[PDB]
Amino acid sequence: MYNTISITVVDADDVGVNFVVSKVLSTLHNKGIFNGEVGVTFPRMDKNVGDIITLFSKTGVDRKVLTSTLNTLTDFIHIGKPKEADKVKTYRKVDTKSKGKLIRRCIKRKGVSAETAESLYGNYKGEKCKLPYIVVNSKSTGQRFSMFLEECENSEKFNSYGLCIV
Amino acid sequence: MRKFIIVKNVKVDGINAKSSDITVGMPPATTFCGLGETMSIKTGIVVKAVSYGSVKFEVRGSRFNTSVTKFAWQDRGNGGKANNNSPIQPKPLADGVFTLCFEVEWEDCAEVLVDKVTNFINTARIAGGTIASFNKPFVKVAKDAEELASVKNAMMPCYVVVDCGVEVNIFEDAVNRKLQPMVNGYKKLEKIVDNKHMRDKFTPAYLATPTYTMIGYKMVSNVDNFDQALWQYGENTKVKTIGGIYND
């Protein structure tokens, strides 16, 4: 089995649920949690995650360090008791890069140069790389990606928020 | 409750624009009621009433004279004459774009109704004109007279036909009331004896002559009572609107 504990966002309609949810997941990642042995799951996700953010682990979530790392947002937050269940819809983030990014790698590496080479690869762009399930956070580099959460089955290896491979 | 199906932008090319010997132009309400009844026969859907509106329309020819269509030889015993232009009756044609709305009895799901309606339209004409293209038909429904206004404005934009009755007669009403005559039905002149030459061997046959009313065109929106613009068959082998004569 795992070890699950749920943080539910409540009384944040002043400031919007999803904004809080993103702030919470951010503060989690920014310092401490998700040391490779925690991951995240949203049991009420439909569009734009939802009202519940559960954390799971096989080595017991520290219910008390949560309440002091979420101390900046504790007024919009209800942390639940450690309950348990065997089964956790696991998610992973989906990247879609713009074409200008693609072209810089294709100039610096992937052998090419000048505009004529932009037009070679710049032939047809993503046309419509739409995506679903956002959570927003500004990374340490200095940009604001729009994380996309796709359901994958259990990888049992996570880095920061979501799944990985081995 | 009350279900309607709307088909917008029915581009039709080649309409038989002669509705009678003294009316050439917009096909009359008898034509669209006959279309609705043809669909009723071909699909099984019960068609309560129909409302039609012109989006574009043009009679072929000039301003005061309609175009001729070139008659092709067609009858037996004319081989000694098929080397010359065939003699020629008048048959003004027109081209247009209409929006249709049928009130229907439907209990099932909308997709089935829409697909049956499309599969019928693909086999039909309108006043003899080839149907070139139509939008995807869509269903709406109304309980009170508030949703009826939404069904009405769903046809936008188009000019629908309202019946404002006859005061004196066709010609005086055209001159004085500045309205437009329209074939609204028929008057039976004599029963036809032998069905040797008819579309049926059994259906009752009559020589007839058209009966008219005085109509007006109005933007489905500006019409208040949508019933005043829904045409159906009825009394005395005429056709008329659900809401009677137009004056709100």
């Binding site: - | 574009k56 175009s67 037996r76 000694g80 080397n83």
Partner: protein, 152 residues
């Protein structure tokens, strides 16, 4: 670019004629959406359908739909059904006509020579035997449509 007066063999014409003959031989329908592109040159005269009107204001009136040049549906029709290469002394395909009529030129290639639609139809109905191309001509007249009058 395709040769018009010869029905030369082409795999795509045949691939569409598959579905067209399937619909004609049975029931249903099939709609082809046709575009034509012609490289004529900047400012070249195009030829819309000409109107048959008694209009004293114009000596030649071109067919228009809200001011745009167009061609009558019936003229496109007369073009399509030009397939008759089976009249006597056949040269070029003519339009399917019960009398092989080309009033355009003042001749009828099926007048009074036992090969008109009515002679051949009376033959077919009254037990006589039909060539493959006489069958094709009669059925193409049926595809044309018509109100054939005279008789009893």
């Amino acid at each position: 670019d395709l040769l018009v007066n010869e029905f030369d063999e082409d795999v795509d014409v045949a691939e569409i004629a598959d579905m067209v003959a399937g619909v004609l031989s049975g029931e249903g329908f099939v709609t082809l959406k046709v575009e034509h592109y012609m490289l004529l040159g900047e400012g070249s005269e195009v030829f819309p359908s000409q109107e048959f009107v008694e209009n004293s204001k114009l000596s030649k009136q071109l067919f228009d739909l809200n001011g745009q040049a167009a061609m009558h549906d019936q003229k496109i029709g007369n073009a399509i059904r030009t397939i008759d290469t089976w009249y006597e002394d056949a040269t070029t395909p003519i339009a399917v006509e019960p009398y092989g009529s080309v009033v355009r030129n003042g001749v009828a290639y099926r007048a009074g020579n036992k090969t008109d639609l009515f002679t051949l139809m009376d033959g077919a109905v009254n037990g006589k035997s039909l060539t493959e191309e006489d069958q094709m001509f009669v059925t193409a007249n049926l595809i044309r449509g018509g109100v054939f009058g005279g008789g009893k």
